[PDB]
Design an enzyme around this catalytic site. Structure first.
Site, PDB file in Angstrom:
ATOM      1  N   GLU A   1       0.812  -1.276  -0.039  1.00 55.21           N
ATOM      2  CA  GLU A   1      -0.072   0.147  -0.004  1.00 55.21           C
ATOM      3  C   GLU A   1       0.937   1.302   0.085  1.00 55.21           C
ATOM      4  OE1 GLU A   1      -4.031   0.449   0.210  1.00 55.21           O
ATOM      5  OE2 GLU A   1      -2.677   1.055  -0.979  1.00 55.21           O
ATOM      6  N   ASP A   2       0.235   2.187  -0.519  1.00 49.77           N
ATOM      7  CA  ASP A   2       0.923   3.660  -0.410  1.00 49.77           C
ATOM      8  C   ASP A   2       0.510   4.272   0.901  1.00 49.77           C
ATOM      9  OD1 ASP A   2      -1.877   3.953  -1.149  1.00 49.77           O
ATOM     10  OD2 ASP A   2      -1.428   5.653  -2.485  1.00 49.77           O
TER      11      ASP A   2
ATOM     12  N   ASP B   1      -4.888   4.879   6.583  1.00 47.31           N
ATOM     13  CA  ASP B   1      -5.351   5.886   7.540  1.00 47.31           C
ATOM     14  C   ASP B   1      -6.549   5.323   8.309  1.00 47.31           C
ATOM     15  OD1 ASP B   1      -6.441   8.341   8.737  1.00 47.31           O
ATOM     16  OD2 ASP B   1      -6.497   9.447   6.948  1.00 47.31           O
TER      17      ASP B   1
ATOM     18  N   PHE C   1      -1.183  17.368   4.088  1.00 43.42           N
ATOM     19  CA  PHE C   1      -1.813  17.034   3.034  1.00 43.42           C
ATOM     20  C   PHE C   1      -0.875  16.779   2.137  1.00 43.42           C
ATOM     21  CE2 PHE C   1      -4.304  16.605  -0.494  1.00 43.42           C
ATOM     22  CZ  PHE C   1      -5.586  16.670  -0.515  1.00 43.42           C
TER      23      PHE C   1
HETATM   24  O1  LIG Z   1      -8.583  14.156  -5.185  1.00 47.07           O
HETATM   25  C1  LIG Z   1      -8.300  14.622  -3.991  1.00 47.07           C
HETATM   26  C2  LIG Z   1      -8.363  13.360  -3.112  1.00 47.07           C
HETATM   27  O2  LIG Z   1      -7.817  12.292  -3.432  1.00 47.07           O
HETATM   28  C3  LIG Z   1      -7.806  11.266  -2.357  1.00 47.07           C
HETATM   29  C4  LIG Z   1      -8.353   9.999  -2.749  1.00 47.07           C
HETATM   30  O3  LIG Z   1      -7.546   9.459  -3.699  1.00 47.07           O
HETATM   31  O4  LIG Z   1      -6.429  11.316  -1.743  1.00 47.07           O
HETATM   32  C5  LIG Z   1      -5.953  10.513  -0.632  1.00 47.07           C
HETATM   33  O5  LIG Z   1      -6.350  10.668   0.736  1.00 47.07           O
HETATM   34  C6  LIG Z   1      -5.500  11.399   1.311  1.00 47.07           C
HETATM   35  C7  LIG Z   1      -6.324  12.283   2.336  1.00 47.07           C
HETATM   36  O6  LIG Z   1      -6.365  13.626   1.606  1.00 47.07           O
HETATM   37  C8  LIG Z   1      -4.325  11.956   0.630  1.00 47.07           C
HETATM   38  O7  LIG Z   1      -3.211  12.853   1.088  1.00 47.07           O
HETATM   39  C9  LIG Z   1      -3.472  11.282  -0.558  1.00 47.07           C
HETATM   40  O8  LIG Z   1      -3.357  12.087  -1.504  1.00 47.07           O
HETATM   41  C10 LIG Z   1      -4.412  10.097  -0.828  1.00 47.07           C
HETATM   42  O9  LIG Z   1      -4.413   9.161   0.186  1.00 47.07           O
HETATM   43  C11 LIG Z   1      -8.332  12.332  -0.990  1.00 47.07           C
HETATM   44  O10 LIG Z   1      -8.186  12.012   0.153  1.00 47.07           O
HETATM   45  C12 LIG Z   1      -8.035  13.642  -1.464  1.00 47.07           C
HETATM   46  O11 LIG Z   1      -9.120  14.741  -1.018  1.00 47.07           O
END
Ligand SMILES: OC[C@H]1O[C@@](CO)(O[C@@H]2O[C@H](CO)[C@@H](O)[C@H](O)[C@H]2O)[C@@H](O)[C@@H]1O
Ligand SMILES: OC[C@H]1O[C@@](CO)(O[C@@H]2O[C@H](CO)[C@@H](O)[C@H](O)[C@H]2O)[C@@H](O)[C@@H]1O
Ligand SMILES: OC[C@H]1O[C@@](CO)(O[C@H]2O[C@H](CO)[C@@H](O)[C@H](O)[C@H]2O)[C@@H](O)[C@@H]1O
Lengths: 180, 180, 188, 198
Positions: free
Chosen positions: D118-119, D122, D171
């Protein structure tokens, strides 16, 4: 020539199937009267029976479908198969009714049943047009059964020989020259 | 507390659908007498009509199914859809008969027809239970049609409202209170 | 049922020679990334890898492609007859987004017969892609069964029994960081 | 300028001709060189732990692809790769983890040692669903390696067996992680500017 030209004997007539489907549909309608179940068929063989069964089931229900394929060895041991098309909606908390054309080894169906329990189905029941209980490789009992057949060597009403004959409106046995 | 209580009016009765399916199946059996076509239904809505039509089609055929989902804007504008379940067998050189419950915009069905032509189908024909030609967003004519309807605001015999009603054995119009 | 004996065996013992070293692969990937980044300056392409063999190369290439872009993946399987003659395959996983109006960049580990890839390229054209291009790490153009020239190529190969960097032999060796040739004893 | 649309259930994306990704990143959180050093270490640990078996290493698309590629190429042991793809069933996935399988494994799980790559983890809900799906399928063992972990974000009990880096309140994008499908191809993990996402 004509498909009847390949059928040695009609085992279950269209009229017999129609009466049974009417009977089973009335029974299922009463059992699920106050809960809209998810009625699921496994492609492709279950399609004709599912269609006529549900059309005789006078209660709110949702239809869905799965497609699976063999992994080979694990499929013929634990029934594990590869999910090609999963359900369009979640299983958790739902009453699931699996509609099947025939149950023989029961392995793949047993795998699916316990997958749905893993997914937290409220309940899982099975209706099958044909049952061959002497073929079981696992203890799996259908809740609703149309007909108990001594063998699984038959075509029609969803059942195929090399992908043909599924469209017969009755269940029959092929002439020997067709397959040998 | 039961389904017919949500229906304002039956537009096409079960008896009219059975007579129509009988007629369509005899025409299709004749047209495909020489070669075994691949009859394809797009899930979920085509299933009941496909089951009953093919049962009344006395000719050699193979059944198969596709499942698709929307991509959003391209789906609404070009008909392009995500393939969730592709055919079990190859299209090249086969006569394809697509079985549908209703054609309205025709965009997705047209995307699929031309995909089968890209895949080198020998021929592609369409049989639909219901047609709403006034709704077209592309020039696509069905080869075989059950009934011409006005509007796609109907349930039963495969057609749904929020995944319910597909199991009615007739085609009807919902009372306004059901969908507000 | 199944018993496995690897003992102190290491994959390198199965390798007759390293054909394309990690260092060679990385220098070429860096060059290709810079060329693609320049070529796709004005668009955000949809970069697609066909599972499974394309994965290692696609990860390294895109990390070296400094431009906005999206990633997607497809999975396909053989139909057994039309596949060998027409390239037609069964789609097991389609793209998660529409192709219409997108600049498609297909990322591949090796092109040999080219039949399946030719099928995919013209599927994407049917789906109204704005453009379709191919980048392949390895090219074996003597194996061709259809006319298909990749737009971007890493290395020309001819060899049989090449593995590593996404290429497998019976599902093993994809995780090697180089491309090697197997000892004949390994596959007898 | 240039634009395109993607799913979903549709977004329209408009880019200025000279917009560059890096300028969207406030700071690099985990450098490419930190990542390389971590994959080398984890790869060696994983190869030692799986010396006796040929594991099935499975990546969940799309985010896991870059880490999976780099980790496995530093894992000097016999192994097989595979991939799954899944989709949300809507609000119910958000609360239970149950997802629609869009691409199942090419091979059976029964009796296999499964390593999921996994990447980021959470809430852990979807991964937990997949771990116990593999246990339902009679996997011999199921372990998890994740590049990034946010373990105080969990909504289900799930401890990853291997973790590259624990992430704080930032983020993050890059190295498989996206914002609106962009940035997955950054060779590092970056902190996206608040202006980009609000
Ligand atoms: O498109 C933005 C959107 O994409 C997400 C889902 O793919 O990204 C992830 O969740 C995390 C929490 O924001 C983020 O940091 C990582 O890029 C991905 O794990 C979603 O969370 C985000 O709003
Ligand atoms: O697609 C993998 C598959 O390909 C086979 C065909 O039987 O041969 C080789 O192709 C591989 C592509 O990954 C490549 O690794 C080798 O160069 C070929 O031996 C088969 O070996 C492999 O399972
Ligand atoms: O065993 C080393 C291995 O463990 C991980 C987590 O899987 O890191 C843990 O151990 C490190 C020291 O050995 C700590 O620095 C770290 O905080 C802790 O999580 C991997 O990162 C590391 O490769």
């Amino acid at each position: 020539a004509m498909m009847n030209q390949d059928i040695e004997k009609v085992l279950i007539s269209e009229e017999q199937i129609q009466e049974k489907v009417l009977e089973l549909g009335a029974i299922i309608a009463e059992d699920y009267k106050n809960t809209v179940p998810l009625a699921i068929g496994v492609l492709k063989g279950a399609m004709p029976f599912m269609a006529d069964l549900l059309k005789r089931t006078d209660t709110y229900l949702e239809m869905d479908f799965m497609a699976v394929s063999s992994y080979g060895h694990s499929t013929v041991s634990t029934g594990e198969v590869k999910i090609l098309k999963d359900l369009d909606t979640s299983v958790e908390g739902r009453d699931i009714l699996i509609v099947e054309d025939i149950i023989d080894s029961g392995l793949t169906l047993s795998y699916l049943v316990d997958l749905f329990k893993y997914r937290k189905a409220k309940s899982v029941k099975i209706v099958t047009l044909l049952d061959k209980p002497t073929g079981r490789k696992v203890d799996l009992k259908a809740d609703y059964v149309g007909f108990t057949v001594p063998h699984e060597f038959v075509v029609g009403y969803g059942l195929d020989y090399k992908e043909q004959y599924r469209n017969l409106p009755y269940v029959g046995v092929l002439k020997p020259s067709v397959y040998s």
